Design a protein around this ligand. Sequence first.
Ligand SMILES: [Ca+2]
Ligand SMILES: [Ca+2]
Ligand SMILES: [Ca+2]
Ligand SMILES: [Ca+2]
Ligand SMILES: [Ca+2]
Lengths: 214, 214, 215, 214, 214
Amino acid sequence: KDDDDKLHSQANLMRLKSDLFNRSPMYPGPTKDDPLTVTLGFTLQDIVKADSSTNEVDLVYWEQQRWKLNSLMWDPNEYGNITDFRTSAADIWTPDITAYSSTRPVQVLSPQNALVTHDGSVQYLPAQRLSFMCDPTGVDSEEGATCAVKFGSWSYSGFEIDLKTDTDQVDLSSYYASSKYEILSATQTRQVRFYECCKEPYPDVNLVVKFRER
Amino acid sequence: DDDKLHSQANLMRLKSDLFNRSPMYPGPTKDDPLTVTLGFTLQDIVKADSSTNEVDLVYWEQQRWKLNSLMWDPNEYGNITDFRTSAADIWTPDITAYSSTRPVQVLSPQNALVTHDGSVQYLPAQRLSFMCDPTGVDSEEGATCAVKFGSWSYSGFEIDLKTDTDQVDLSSYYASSKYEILSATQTRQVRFYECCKEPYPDVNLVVKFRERRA
Amino acid sequence: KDDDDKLHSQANLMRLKSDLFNRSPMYPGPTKDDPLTVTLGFTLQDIVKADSSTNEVDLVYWEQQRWKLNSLMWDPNEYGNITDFRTSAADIWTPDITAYSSTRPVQVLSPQNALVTHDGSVQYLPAQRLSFMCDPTGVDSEEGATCAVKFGSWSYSGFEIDLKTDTDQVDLSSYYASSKYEILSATQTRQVRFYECCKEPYPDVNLVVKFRERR
Amino acid sequence: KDDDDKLHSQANLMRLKSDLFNRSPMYPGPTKDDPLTVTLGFTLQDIVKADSSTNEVDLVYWEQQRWKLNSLMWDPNEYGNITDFRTSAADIWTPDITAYSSTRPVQVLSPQNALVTHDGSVQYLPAQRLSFMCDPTGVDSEEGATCAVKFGSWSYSGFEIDLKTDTDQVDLSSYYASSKYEILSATQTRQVRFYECCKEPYPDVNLVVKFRER
Amino acid sequence: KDDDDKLHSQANLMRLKSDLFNRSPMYPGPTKDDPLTVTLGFTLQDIVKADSSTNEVDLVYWEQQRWKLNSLMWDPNEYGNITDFRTSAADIWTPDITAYSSTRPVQVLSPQNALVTHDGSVQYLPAQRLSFMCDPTGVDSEEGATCAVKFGSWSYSGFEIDLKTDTDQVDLSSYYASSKYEILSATQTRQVRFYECCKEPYPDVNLVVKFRER
Ligand SMILES: [Ca+2]
Ligand SMILES: [Ca+2]
Ligand SMILES: [Ca+2]
Ligand SMILES: [Ca+2]
Ligand SMILES: [Ca+2]
């Protein structure tokens, strides 16, 4: 029937993934000779808890992560005109992007699956709840409290993974309307760290949150 | 007994033919869409926390959907109309609560039921913590919080959603719960984010609840 | 001498296990054409906590389940007079029994291993901590508080898994004598339910507990 | 040259582990025909917490399991004089030894790796935290509180696994000097249980602890 | 293009890794005849909490670990002038270093990947959160409170793993300034114990922290 056509479609996809994944061992990840740029952005959904005793604060957000590999690339025409597909994040390489301030291991609130597009670009969007070092003090005043946490590669250097932001403006469109706390400013600024011990740049994306109780 | 051996063999052969012989289903495509039906059975509201503005639910979430590739003729399979299977042996939809502040906990064995026409019924029971403002939970009107459920990585063109009723199922609601239910609904909506020209469905659970005075 | 003889038992069990399990395809589970019965019963060790705020109660108990598979059947003479063995519960089908009204994922206190006997009967004894839905009002009256939780197949009906008890009363023989909570009465009894929607039976074992604070 | 000798010793160890484990099948565990004796002893590090609300107490201890199997036995002469080796607990059979009266799944504080000796004897020293049933009353009394816990096989009778202790003396030499509770006495004693229902013996080691606040 | 050398540099790395990890079976560990020296160092980040009912304090640090394996060496000129690479820590052997006085299974805050360099050296930098045994009494004094915890191999003696520090000074450059507690002193110092049971030495690196509130 028109049944036959949906099968054809599955097969082009079952075929496309196999060619991508099962016909090379694995992407070793980026190197100084193959570099990689990861674009970060944040949508801040909530500030759930501010804790004066430990000076820890707990956020819920979605971290948009975007990077392009030549190793995932295909002619849609060879594959039934498939321009993209969804797949398990465990089937691909994902950058090691970590907060440098976490006081507790991140918890993942969303299915780990990513979108891969024929030009070789991957867009992964993990929702996470994160506890990090923050001093809430002033959160009950009208000026509020100010906290910052940095994100970047844990193990690579600017020569292998670089970070980039589409905007310095964190996305509040989805922020919880009734959250215990309200948001004055949120911004995401890319920076470069240097260390005396080394000749390389270490990039990070700085999240600054300015909030107070409703 | 004699025939018991056969029924056994008939089932194993069926699952071999569905799963060993045929590869992993790649999931829905723009050219091979799904529709997942949602319904909720609310069982308890366990805790309301106004420090963090978080509420905890226990419910059963029913998911039903259909794949041709799970389809078979009972007469080659010894009149097997349906069978129960581990959920890991099949593709399941990546359906997530959009406002969860803690990773969902699963309270039930994860197994599903597949019927000869290719339909799957999956009914996971969960504890969810989502963003809710309890204010007014001690008062006659109660409080109103809502949470949405949708695919995380797929748009309406690939995974679509419907409900059987807009009425959430309260027949199992624990009668001594600290909170009593004033109303519970599950409603299907579509949103556009115009970064993209295609629909995003979600099922919206709205619950109004009140401390049980008694 | 007898070291060498003990070495033969070891190879016989190794071989029984190999013949049963990975020389046989994974058992599909019960059918309506191949049904089974699970016998359930509880040994209640502790009432750990009763939360008046969230209305949930934490129990510790060992849950005895038994069932009999024909596929696990064997003749002890072909296998060296081996009548039974301990095995990893991951190595065999186990039933889907679950508490119907828990508020948290159940926690296993015990290694998970099962005993397999040559008639194909299996005994499994998970020790658990369970938070179920409970209103601990009156815990401080001589009348005490009463809560109940049901266990049963989550995905199978009475036509694939029948469910039952050996005795109708929870084993209190191991109950912690210094827990904050005394037990007035503890019950486990089978019930069968039907639904309007569907014509087939759903069995469950209903566990009912009455408890006081310890004076 | 000095290296080759370092290199050659690795080859010898690798060779032995291969002969021992992947060459031979996984040991099924004890039988009534192949009984096994497990030696238990405790080193009590800390009493972390006592909850007089729920009546549970929290210990941090190191448990020393030791046992022996001919299957692990080797002649060091064929192994370049290798007497012993360290390995992960996954690579070998371990007794299923559990606290009978725990209220919480045990948390393992140490890397799980054991020591096998050429006479076929394993020594396993897992560091754990345990929450078990204890009623604290008196802990602020000179007399102190006494609680007690049993350890033994969850699934095996005295006919498959027998228990012993090297000594009856619990080792307090590593106990935390500044712990909230000072230890009064601690004893580890072998017991054997019988049931009317069944003919066979169940041993256990009963750990008894008398403690009070500092 | 220059997508080639990118392609070839990528090809060279996969070849190197397979030549290390798939030529020869995973390495057996150090042995008295193939001993190993691990260098430890600590970057202390935050003291997150001090619980004085249980006497437990919580640290967030990054432990630096280095060791050299002959079996990890290669010749850059055979491998494309590659001088080092980043890899998952699961692919390679790692030492059993742990905290001797922890009260909870330690938590891992960072992606676990290590840096392997051509001379066979590995740098691993786990970020951890540790709850250990600490009597915080005095934390409100001018003097503040002093606590200590030891680190070292769990199963390995000094004959197989030795410990070393580059400096006896913990690295406070990353310490969180708005942290609830101030750091008066921090030292990491090699010690060597003889345990009476066993003939050989067991070194540890003793972490000493003097901190107070404010
Ligand atoms: Ca870094
Ligand atoms: Ca979305
Ligand atoms: Ca049901
Ligand atoms: Ca027992
Ligand atoms: Ca030690």
